[PDB]
Design a protein around this ligand. Structure first.
Ligand code: NA
Length: 129
């Protein structure tokens, strides 16, 4: 599923991401734009041979099982394929664990390089929330 910007903002807010660990809704929408272009089916191979899955490009090195990432963990206890669903529940639940790990949203390199310190409220502008 390719989410609309406000459509994804509504879904992330319903699932309790607005101001989760102090990160406003616009930070999460901005991360999703540059990670996945709001596409739940996005997959991208990392150089280390792990893969990133779904709207928030969650890595198989630590967070989900894809059966092809030697020496990896599955700390969200989910198949990585569950991170591609049109229903973002599994992605959001797993993102809450990631952002709680100690480095906040710096875990998402695209957030750090493209969203951090910017006017992220622009990403929820015009949305009925
Ligand atoms: Na894994």
């Amino acid at each position: 599923k390719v989410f609309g910007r406000c459509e994804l903002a509504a879904a992330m807010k319903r699932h309790g991401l607005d101001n989760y660990r102090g990160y406003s809704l616009g930070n999460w929408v901005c991360a999703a734009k540059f990670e996945s272009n709001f596409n739940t089916q996005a997959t991208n191979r990392n150089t280390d041979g792990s893969t990133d899955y779904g709207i928030l490009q969650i890595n198989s090195r630590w967070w989900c099982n894809d059966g092809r990432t030697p020496g990896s963990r599955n700390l969200c206890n989910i198949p990585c394929s569950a991170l591609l669903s049109s229903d973002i529940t599994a992605s959001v639940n797993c993102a809450k664990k990631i952002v709680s790990d100690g480095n906040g949203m710096n875990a998402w390199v695209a957030w750090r390089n493209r969203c951090k310190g910017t006017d992220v409220q622009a990403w929820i502008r015009g949305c009925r929330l």
